[PDB]
Design an enzyme around this catalytic site. Sequence first.
Site, PDB file in Angstrom:
ATOM      1  N   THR A  91      46.111  44.609  32.247  1.00  0.00           N
ATOM      2  CA  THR A  91      47.563  44.583  32.112  1.00  0.00           C
ATOM      3  C   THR A  91      48.143  43.486  31.178  1.00  0.00           C
ATOM      4  OG1 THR A  91      47.878  45.770  34.199  1.00  0.00           O
ATOM      5  CG2 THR A  91      49.735  44.386  33.445  1.00  0.00           C
ATOM      6  N   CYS A 108      41.987  35.454  34.790  1.00  0.00           N
ATOM      7  CA  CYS A 108      40.819  35.280  35.609  1.00  0.00           C
ATOM      8  C   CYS A 108      40.233  33.908  35.303  1.00  0.00           C
ATOM      9  CB  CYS A 108      39.861  36.442  35.289  1.00  0.00           C
ATOM     10  SG  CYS A 108      38.165  36.275  35.733  1.00  0.00           S
ATOM     11  N   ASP A 152      33.937  16.023  44.304  1.00  0.00           N
ATOM     12  CA  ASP A 152      34.238  15.280  45.528  1.00  0.00           C
ATOM     13  C   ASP A 152      35.015  13.957  45.299  1.00  0.00           C
ATOM     14  OD1 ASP A 152      34.223  14.836  48.266  1.00  0.00           O
ATOM     15  OD2 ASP A 152      32.354  13.695  48.190  1.00  0.00           O
ATOM     16  N   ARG A 168      33.435  16.492  50.711  1.00  0.00           N
ATOM     17  CA  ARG A 168      32.635  16.019  51.828  1.00  0.00           C
ATOM     18  C   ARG A 168      33.308  16.323  53.153  1.00  0.00           C
ATOM     19  NH1 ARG A 168      32.656   9.761  50.550  1.00  0.00           N
ATOM     20  NH2 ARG A 168      32.688  10.699  48.433  1.00  0.00           N
ATOM     21  N   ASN A 214      34.942  34.554  41.076  1.00  0.00           N
ATOM     22  CA  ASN A 214      36.390  34.587  40.861  1.00  0.00           C
ATOM     23  C   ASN A 214      37.107  35.173  42.078  1.00  0.00           C
ATOM     24  OD1 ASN A 214      35.246  37.224  40.365  1.00  0.00           O
ATOM     25  ND2 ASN A 214      37.158  37.817  39.404  1.00  0.00           N
ATOM     26  N   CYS A 262      37.984  38.262  42.709  1.00  0.00           N
ATOM     27  CA  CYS A 262      37.495  39.575  43.109  1.00  0.00           C
ATOM     28  C   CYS A 262      35.984  39.724  43.189  1.00  0.00           C
ATOM     29  CB  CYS A 262      38.066  40.640  42.165  1.00  0.00           C
ATOM     30  SG  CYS A 262      39.874  40.704  42.167  1.00  0.00           S
ATOM     31  N   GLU A 288      33.402  39.613  41.109  1.00  0.00           N
ATOM     32  CA  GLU A 288      32.561  40.229  40.090  1.00  0.00           C
ATOM     33  C   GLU A 288      32.187  39.260  38.937  1.00  0.00           C
ATOM     34  OE1 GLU A 288      35.829  40.474  39.857  1.00  0.00           O
ATOM     35  OE2 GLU A 288      36.384  40.784  37.796  1.00  0.00           O
ATOM     36  N   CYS A 304      37.247  34.686  31.665  1.00  0.00           N
ATOM     37  CA  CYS A 304      36.578  35.891  31.265  1.00  0.00           C
ATOM     38  C   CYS A 304      37.616  36.910  30.873  1.00  0.00           C
ATOM     39  CB  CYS A 304      35.705  36.416  32.383  1.00  0.00           C
ATOM     40  SG  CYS A 304      34.413  37.520  31.785  1.00  0.00           S
ATOM     41  N   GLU A 325      43.041  49.308  39.472  1.00  0.00           N
ATOM     42  CA  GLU A 325      44.025  50.107  40.177  1.00  0.00           C
ATOM     43  C   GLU A 325      44.935  50.605  39.089  1.00  0.00           C
ATOM     44  OE1 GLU A 325      46.096  49.895  44.214  1.00  0.00           O
ATOM     45  OE2 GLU A 325      45.134  51.679  43.332  1.00  0.00           O
ATOM     46  N   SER A 337      44.811  50.326  35.624  1.00  0.00           N
ATOM     47  CA  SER A 337      44.203  50.951  34.428  1.00  0.00           C
ATOM     48  C   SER A 337      43.574  52.282  34.784  1.00  0.00           C
ATOM     49  CB  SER A 337      43.095  50.052  33.854  1.00  0.00           C
ATOM     50  OG  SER A 337      43.168  48.739  34.414  1.00  0.00           O
ATOM     51  N   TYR A 376      32.465  41.886  48.255  1.00  0.00           N
ATOM     52  CA  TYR A 376      33.888  41.753  48.248  1.00  0.00           C
ATOM     53  C   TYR A 376      34.439  42.391  49.555  1.00  0.00           C
ATOM     54  CZ  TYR A 376      38.475  41.978  45.947  1.00  0.00           C
ATOM     55  OH  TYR A 376      39.802  41.835  45.622  1.00  0.00           O
ATOM     56  N   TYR A 377      35.564  43.103  49.490  1.00  0.00           N
ATOM     57  CA  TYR A 377      36.250  43.639  50.670  1.00  0.00           C
ATOM     58  C   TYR A 377      35.349  44.351  51.673  1.00  0.00           C
ATOM     59  CZ  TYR A 377      40.908  43.377  48.227  1.00  0.00           C
ATOM     60  OH  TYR A 377      42.074  42.986  47.579  1.00  0.00           O
TER      61      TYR A 377
END
Lengths: 16, 16, 578, 146, 728
Positions: free
Chosen positions: C56, C72, C79, C109, C278, C280, C282, C303, C464, C466, C571-572
């Site tokens: 997009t 992305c 630390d 830590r 990232n 999502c 991938e 990316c 979704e 595209s 993922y999900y």
Amino acid sequence: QIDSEVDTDDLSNFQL
Amino acid sequence: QIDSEVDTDDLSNFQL
Amino acid sequence: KYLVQNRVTGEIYESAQFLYILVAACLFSNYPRETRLQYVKRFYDAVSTFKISLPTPIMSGVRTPTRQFSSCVLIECGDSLDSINATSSAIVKYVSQRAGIGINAGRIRALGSPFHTGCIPFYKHFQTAVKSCSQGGVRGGAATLFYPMWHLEVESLLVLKNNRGVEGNRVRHMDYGVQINKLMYTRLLKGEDITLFSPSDVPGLYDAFFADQEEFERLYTKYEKDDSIRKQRVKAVELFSLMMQERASTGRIYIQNVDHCNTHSPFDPAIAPVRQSNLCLEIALPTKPLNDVNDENGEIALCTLSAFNLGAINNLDELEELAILAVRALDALLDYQDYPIPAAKRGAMGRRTLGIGVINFAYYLAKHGKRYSDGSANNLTHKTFEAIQYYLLKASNELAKEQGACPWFNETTYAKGILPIDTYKKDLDTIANEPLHYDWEALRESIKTHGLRNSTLSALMPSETSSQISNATNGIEPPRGYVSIKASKDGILRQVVPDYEHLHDAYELLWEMPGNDGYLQLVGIMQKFIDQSISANTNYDPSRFPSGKVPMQQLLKDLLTAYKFGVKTLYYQNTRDG
Amino acid sequence: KYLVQNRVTGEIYESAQFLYILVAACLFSNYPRETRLQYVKRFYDAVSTFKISLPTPIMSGVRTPTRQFSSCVLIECGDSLDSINATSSAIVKYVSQRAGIGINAGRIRALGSPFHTGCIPFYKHFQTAVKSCSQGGVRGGAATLF
Amino acid sequence: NLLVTKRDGSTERINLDKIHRVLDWAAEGLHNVSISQVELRSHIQFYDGIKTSDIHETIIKAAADLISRDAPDYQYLAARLAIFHLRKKAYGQFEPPALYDHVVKMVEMGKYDNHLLEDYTEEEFKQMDTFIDHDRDMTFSYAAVKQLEGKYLVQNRVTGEIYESAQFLYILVAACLFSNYPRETRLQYVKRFYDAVSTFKISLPTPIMSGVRTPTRQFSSCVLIECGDSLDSINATSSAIVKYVSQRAGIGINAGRIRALGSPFHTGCIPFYKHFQTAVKSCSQGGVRGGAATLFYPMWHLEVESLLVLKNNRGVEGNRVRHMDYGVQINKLMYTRLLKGEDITLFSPSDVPGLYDAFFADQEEFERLYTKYEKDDSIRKQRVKAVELFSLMMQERASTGRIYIQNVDHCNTHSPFDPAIAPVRQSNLCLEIALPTKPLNDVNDENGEIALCTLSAFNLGAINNLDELEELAILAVRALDALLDYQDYPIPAAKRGAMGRRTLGIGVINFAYYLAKHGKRYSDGSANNLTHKTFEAIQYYLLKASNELAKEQGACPWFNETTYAKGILPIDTYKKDLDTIANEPLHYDWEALRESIKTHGLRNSTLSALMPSETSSQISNATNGIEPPRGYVSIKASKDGILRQVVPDYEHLHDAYELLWEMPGNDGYLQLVGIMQKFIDQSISANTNYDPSRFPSGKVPMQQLLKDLLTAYKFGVKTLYYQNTRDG
């Protein structure tokens, strides 16, 4: 909901 | 739920 | 979202073919006049006939005055307060440009350490950084935060999105990726204990977790025996169960197999390890902590994405030209786009990382008469994903000959003449026997000699928006149904799956799959060839199980199956309600 | 809170008059030897007889290896992401040293402006900055925002 | 390649041809099953290194998950795969060992009783082995096999090991029960009983199926205990309950003699009921799961309004006793008060001499005593509207499904027992058992009587005709009568009932299926004459078998207390109104039987009772007891997956079946129950059913609840068990 029952013996078979 | 309405006259007919 | 318009007044200013020709014209603008208009025409034909899909930000913005196209970003936190601050600052900057963030915060830590007060208050601070440019501090702004399974605070971390509990113990509006390696899984299988450590107390262990499994094992068992080290023991069963319970109830506790991310990888892990993903799950790229927002020695990974539409190609050799076009268009965008953080410019200019995936995979299987659930698609997927990777690698190798390899090409396994076909999880041999059809040995020598323009080429992302433009099934996912439904101000928006008329019985709908095995085997097969990772879902219909409850046994067996076939990330988790 | 001690083992190492004489000795340490010990004696007499009171960071710390004595900081935020970030960073640094903060955030532009999303999500971010070094992200860490 | 972890530790390449061949074997004779579908679904779940037994479970479950009404034969595919797997588990091969070798081994492991090897020679085991047909294991459905493996087959419940197969269970149950028979007839009875059970003609209870052949002697699952109005009897009753529930028996408790709250048991029935409940639950998981009882009291009991509401969810804990069921005892006079819109008078049994006794034994004496005491203002009493009392009872029955009814006049006017001597004053857990009892003074009181009953059933769907019942009745009566001498008795008063009366309760399963294949239904009266005919044959042949057993072995010690002894038969005492709803003639010679019973007596004071079934019905793939199925496919949860069972011959009979909720009402079913009861010695676990969506505003009217109750009474129905209300 889920069933938290875990057969630990069945798992030991698996080969990563 | 149920309907507690009772026709007592209708019952009197019955023959045990 | 695509067409240039006045968002104040409602005016639309362009039509779709102007968007497409001008995206092409902008991306290829620096090409010599000898080839320029030929690339433009060819890229225009590829996008306007739906063979290639773009994100997009590119579709809305390339042709306009903006240079914000990064969606992305991956940021690793060190630390220290300085790095915590720099990380927060970089998040804020990038979320104001609507990027999704992957945050590695696993080095912070634990609570009680000589970060005396713990990870959680810093996690809360990362969340408000992510939500800083969001409507009412909630709508918009998205992040996934990563930490090791052996982190001392892990049981607290695992329950951060749980609805009940004290607000102080909850960080609900980010997602989480739990990082796991073979040793953790072995403890589970053997019914043994996992030992939890703060990363500050265990020299070399964090590094070894990602880079060197035998060193990790040596350091880990050593430190487990040293009673001077602060530590805690938990049952592997109980820890894994807790993680899977939280994954199941939210769908949003994710998994990264960090050994797989590094044994089968474009990058040498001694130099440039992959230590996070990232939003999502991938994307898998190297990072370095910042000392300051403007630290030139930090590395933030970025990316640039695209996808091939598997349903719009008549055959696989069409990917040769599509790969040339997609690699070249995105590589040019790397030089065109802005970089608000120096460390992000460093990652992009150094590694020139791309993530080209696919859409319309379900449809493609259907028209080839295959299914997800039964193994019928295994060899076809092997064949398909070989062609994608081969041709991507070929296009980037040619681009390197023409324009130069990426500055940090020498840090890739590619530089040492190592290919994805050399390092994949061997168990894949048991579930497909498709031969290689392309000349990888010739490609190997050409890469050794001329290098790659881009350190990574492939990643399988969700889609979704595209997918909808092409009327494609999303990414690699089976459709939930034949008709998708969206709410809008303009009415109920319906979309029917492509060629429902002739293919309705050939499709396998998500909830028609008896289980996850076949799909995970396809993911594993895809991963043989993919440079980064794949946004793989797991799915469970309660009504397939006794008393409508999904058993933990099945949750863990699927997790183990994923690992065994070399799946890098999960993922999900979708649970059918019904 | 005042006397130098082992917070691990419970051991106390000093008594109140050593604290007072040494606070005086440290603060007047650079004075010329002509006046130095006179200032020390006089300041010692003033504090140990309660005529002058000092804050806790001074009483606990002056005489010890620390140099953290700032307990009261005022930070003004400008209407930009860069200034919002710098402000947040400075808060985190100072609350880790247990300072109270006054934050001026009144320049941040309102919701709906051509900070399109408003003050509140930035206020929330200042709060987590303030609470970043607090027990369970609540106990300790204090700020007033203007 | 793909590797398999062998049954111990070794590894070999997978044998996909071997898997295909076993599936092909299992599919033989079946229709609309796809071996290749089963292969696809299971093989996708295999991984390099998979245990051999995990391959088996995977393919079994893949077949099982495909069971549906369109492909019912997956029931048989999955079953045969499970059988195959269980053969390998028990024997390390498919072919079972010789019967002698198996028994010797099992006796060595302490799994079979060594009396088997004492009572039969090796030569006799070889002979019995010739009777066996191991291929009858191929006739079980999947849910049958899961019931066998979960509860029937001898196994290690610690380690998961299964030690036997179904035909060994069946031959050895037969061998044990007939072990004392003279060698002239013994092996003939064994063979015949073995053939009857393994071909599903006769069904036995779970304690017999799991235990007969093993070292246990605990086979009593059904006990009836009457409590007297004293602390000593309350204590003895409690003690006997505890003893019997530790052996997993269901209890019927008569506690209606306990005097009411406020009596000169000053503190009432309820705290004693609570104590009976903890006695029942004393050997239950977390004092709730397992342990079951139904407690009985008269409708005219002074505390009845408090008793009626004991399982109601709301209310004070002190006023609630929720984990037992209740049977309210009613006679004609109570019903007459309802019909006449009159009052019922409530009395404590302690204040009304002879009234409790008369309630059960003598309706005219009850009427005389009852009206007398109603007029005597010196007697403590309370008046309630019969409408209000009946309504309250029916409201509690409707909301819990578990306030039951016993028509105690019917239980005694139409009965194997003379009520002046041996009245029936209660029932059991499930409301089909009706036997005499006497209160205990002490757990070990030798003058008490606890009733026990040994059960079985005829499978109406496995017989080609009714005259087959002659041989089945001989077999079932003899097998159960022998079990009476074999089983243990933990309480002396229970041994007294069993040895004195030798009471049996043989019922039926597969009644719905039987009606369907005869083209009849429950709801419309089309089954009336067929049911008359069927139940005549059952009772006649049962009575005939027990009469012959009496000639051979002796009548039961207390035979003289039965109406049978006086030459009275069930055909003499049934509710006359039955004549208006069936006109089937008697086909058997009851007059000849009458003289033979008068002369030689019966081995057993009762033979017939119609119990619910679930487990035994499942083994046979039979419809349960006399009940219509709720649907065509039954569904059970398990650790091994969703267990489906399709009704028998769904393929040809789906339209012939009448599903429970297809019945327009209860009348036709109650007429069948009444017709059955003409012949049945004890009682019948009769359900009532109501679908709210058949009624205006989705509410079941009280008028209809009471009319069905009255219909039951008018057709001589002795008891009413569950009220099922459809939710939907």
